[PDB]
Design a protein around this ligand. Structure first.
Ligand SMILES: *[C@@H]1O[C@H](CO[C@@H]2O[C@@H](C)[C@@H](O)[C@@H](O)[C@@H]2O)[C@@H](O[C@@H]2O[C@H](CO)[C@@H](O[C@@H]3O[C@H](CO[C@H]4O[C@H](CO)[C@@H](O)[C@H](O)[C@@H]4O)[C@@H](O)[C@H](O[C@H]4O[C@H](CO)[C@@H](O)[C@H](O)[C@@H]4O)[C@@H]3O)[C@H](O)[C@H]2NC(C)=O)[C@H](O)[C@H]1NC(C)=O
Ligand SMILES: *[C@@H]1O[C@H](CO)[C@@H](O[C@@H]2O[C@H](CO)[C@@H](O[C@@H]3O[C@H](CO)[C@@H](O)[C@H](O[C@H]4O[C@H](CO)[C@@H](O)[C@H](O)[C@@H]4O[C@H]4O[C@H](CO)[C@@H](O)[C@H](O)[C@@H]4O)[C@@H]3O)[C@H](O)[C@H]2NC(C)=O)[C@H](O)[C@H]1NC(C)=O
Ligand SMILES: CCCCCCCCCCCCCC[C@@H](O)[C@@H](O)[C@H](CO[C@H]1O[C@H](CO)[C@H](O)[C@H](O)[C@H]1O)NC(=O)CCCCCCCc1ccccc1
Ligand SMILES: CCCCCCCCCCCCCCCC(=O)O
Ligand SMILES: *[C@@H]1O[C@H](CO)[C@@H](O)[C@H](O)[C@H]1NC(C)=O
Lengths: 99, 268
């Protein structure tokens, strides 16, 4: 049966405005493994995103980590958008500015 | 304890399209990947060959190379034989490896899932279906059990090659496996206070909201989330009534810190 992806978005270092950092999007609990993940800055696709190899957990569901350099500031939003057969529309999760 | 697990994920889209990819972990550190696009198994650490010689690595690689092709032909034949009773798309996953415990003891495993559900393991000297697996798997598993050379190879790999190879990995990779990286922490937010702790390794950590020496009971620990640099991230949250946040602190204990805990005071 298909399982729907969960998406968590969080920063490698304390987010401090104007300071270069790393934003992570961790996508888990999904099946089947085919998926497309984009990271968004102000609603636009961020070009250089790096992905880990796909792997799977003890319960057999897949997971993968995407990450990108970013500089938070109080005029930019960040998000992670996922397309998967389990959902009719892409699911987008915004960084909550704290994580 | 350290668990070594070789994880294979194979996708069969239809008669003409399939792919097989694997990753290998020792504990929470990745040691290999093997892309479908690649003829050979790639190292992800300076010590991914453990204590094997260039020549013994090539022979182990050779065996997997034959298996990857054998595996793909076997599943594609099975689907033809069963057709159209078992339609594509098909997803097969295998998790195999060994757990190294206290002393020099170890236990090995080889589990197989089909469409996301555990169906088959190798145990002792044979392949078995697990109870609840679809009954059409019985006959192909009986046939695979007649293949004595495959059974002998699998018993060797599970009972002998695995713990041997992982002993070489644990020696060769010692400095990475015993690395200590220090967490940084920061606070944010009746309301819900959040303590974020990131960049620690190894995984065990203690994170708690404190008033003074008193641990605050309502502390909820989040899930452990990986960073992209082989370190860990965790949040602990505490719902507090508005006003009563003065006097609260997040406390972090971790092997890398010595006994110099991080203490971060709210409103500080
Ligand atoms: C590799 O190790 C295997 C054991 O390890 C487990 O499985 C492997 C794959 C790993 O995952 C590991 O970490 C696991 O813990 C080992 O398998 C053992 O092999 C022997 C024979 O080679 C089996 O012996 C036969 O046992 C049956 C009884 O089996 C049933 O009962 C026992 C308990 O009593 C259960 O454990 C079994 O699950 C079954 O419920 C006997 O009937 C049979 O005796 C007959 O045949 C022999 C000739 O071989 C005669 O001499 C006898 O007198 C009888 O005629 C055997 O005694 C043993 O069951 C099996 N263990 C398991 C769990 O299946 C394997 O051999 C190792 N291979 C190599 C190369 O090292
Ligand atoms: C995962 O890895 C496995 C193992 O390698 C891949 O399996 C191999 O896949 C290749 C390519 O699909 C396949 O090679 C083909 O064999 C066909 C017949 O079975 C050939 O007919 C075909 O030749 C054409 O394509 C070549 C380019 O790849 C051209 O060089 C050649 O000139 C031919 O081109 C003509 O025909 C093609 C259509 O095939 C057409 O598009 C062109 O215009 C032109 O007219 C291939 O050589 C291997 O046999 C497979 N090896 C195996 C199974 O061991 C597997 O595909 C990977 N999976 C994924 C998703 O990447
Ligand atoms: C549709 C749902 C199906 C559910 C899946 C069923 C589980 C299938 C598991 C089948 C695994 C083996 C597949 C290949 C075998 O069938 C053999 O073709 C193949 C070749 O066999 C010939 O050569 C050998 C020489 O080495 C022997 O002489 C043998 O006698 C001879 O028949 N045997 C081999 O290649 C033996 C080595 C098998 C190793 C299995 C490793 C599994 C694994 C990989 C990665 C991660 C985790 C786990
Ligand atoms: C029984 C199948 C897997 C168990 C192999 C025991 C460990 C031997 C060491 C191999 C290191 C890398 C092998 C990965 C190959 C693959 O993923 O297909
Ligand atoms: C099989 O599926 C592949 C991958 O999804 C798709 O591109 C194509 O329709 C199929 N390939 C062939 C040769 O029919």
């Amino acid at each position: 049966i298909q399982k729907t992806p969960q998406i968590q978005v969080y920063s490698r270092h304390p987010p401090e405005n104007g300071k270069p950092n790393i934003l992570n999007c961790y996508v888990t609990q999904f099946h089947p493994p085919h998926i497309e993940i984009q990271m968004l800055k102000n609603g636009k696709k961020i070009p250089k995103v790096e992905m880990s190899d796909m792997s799977f957990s003890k319960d057999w569901s897949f997971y993968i980590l995407a990450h990108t350099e970013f500089t938070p500031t109080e005029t930019d939003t960040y998000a992670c958008r996922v397309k998967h057969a389990s959902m009719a529309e892409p699911k987008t999760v915004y960084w909550d500015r704290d994580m | 304890n350290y668990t070594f697990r070789c994880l294979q994920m194979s996708s069969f889209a239809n008669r003409s399209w399939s792919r097989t990819d694997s990753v290998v972990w020792l504990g929470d550190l990745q040691t290999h990947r093997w892309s479908n696009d690649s003829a050979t198994i790639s190292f992800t650490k300076p010590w991914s060959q453990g204590k094997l010689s260039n020549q013994q690595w090539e022979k182990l690689q050779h065996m997997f190379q034959v298996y990857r092709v054998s595996f793909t032909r076997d599943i594609q034949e099975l689907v033809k034989m069963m057709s159209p009773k078992e339609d594509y798309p098909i997803e097969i996953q295998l998790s195999a490896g060994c757990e190294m415990y206290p002393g020099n003891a170890s236990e090995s495993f080889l589990h197989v899932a089909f469409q996301g559900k555990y169906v088959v393991r190798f145990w002792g000297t044979s392949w078995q279906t697990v109870p609840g697996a679809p009954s059409w798997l019985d006959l192909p598993i009986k046939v695979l059990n007649a293949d004595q050379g495959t059974s002998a190879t699998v018993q060797m790999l599970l009972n002998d090659t695995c713990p041997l190879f992982v002993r070489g990995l644990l020696e060769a990779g010692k400095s990475d496996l015993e690395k200590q990286e220090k967490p940084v922490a920061w606070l944010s937010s009746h309301r819900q206070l959040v303590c974020h702790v990131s960049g620690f390794y190894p995984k065990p950590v203690w994170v708690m909201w404190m008033r003074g020496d008193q641990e605050q009971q309502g502390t909820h620990r989040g899930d452990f989330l990986p960073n992209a640099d082989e370190t860990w991230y965790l949040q602990a949250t505490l719902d507090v009534e508005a006003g009563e946040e003065a006097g609260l602190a997040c406390r972090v204990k971790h092997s890398s810190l010595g006994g110099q805990d991080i203490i971060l005071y709210w409103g500080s």
